[PDB]
């Protein structure tokens, strides 16, 4: 979309945080589900 790195990182930053949150939640759920 934007050749600018700053903007590029910001654009991907959004989806990066969302994806990370899902991963973290999964790990936790497993901990609780386990015991």
Experimental technique, in short, is NMR
Two tokens, residue 3:
């050749």
Helix (H, G, I), strand (E, B) or coil at 35: coil
Cα separation of 35 and 29, whole Å? 10
* Radius of gyration, alpha carbons of the chain: 15
Two tokens, residue 24:
């973290």
Cα separation of 19 and 11, whole Å? 13
Yes or no: say if 11 and 1 are a contact pair by the CB < 8 Å rule: yes
Cα separation of 26 and 35, whole Å? 14
Cα separation of 13 and 32, whole Å? 29
Residue showing tokens 């990182």 = 9
**Sign of dihedral through CA atoms 19, 23, 28, 33?**
positive
């Amino acid at each position: 979309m934007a050749e600018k790195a700053g903007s590029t990182f910001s654009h991907l930053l959004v989806p990066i945080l969302l994806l990370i949150g899902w991963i973290v939640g999964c790990i936790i759920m497993i901990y609780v589900v386990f015991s």
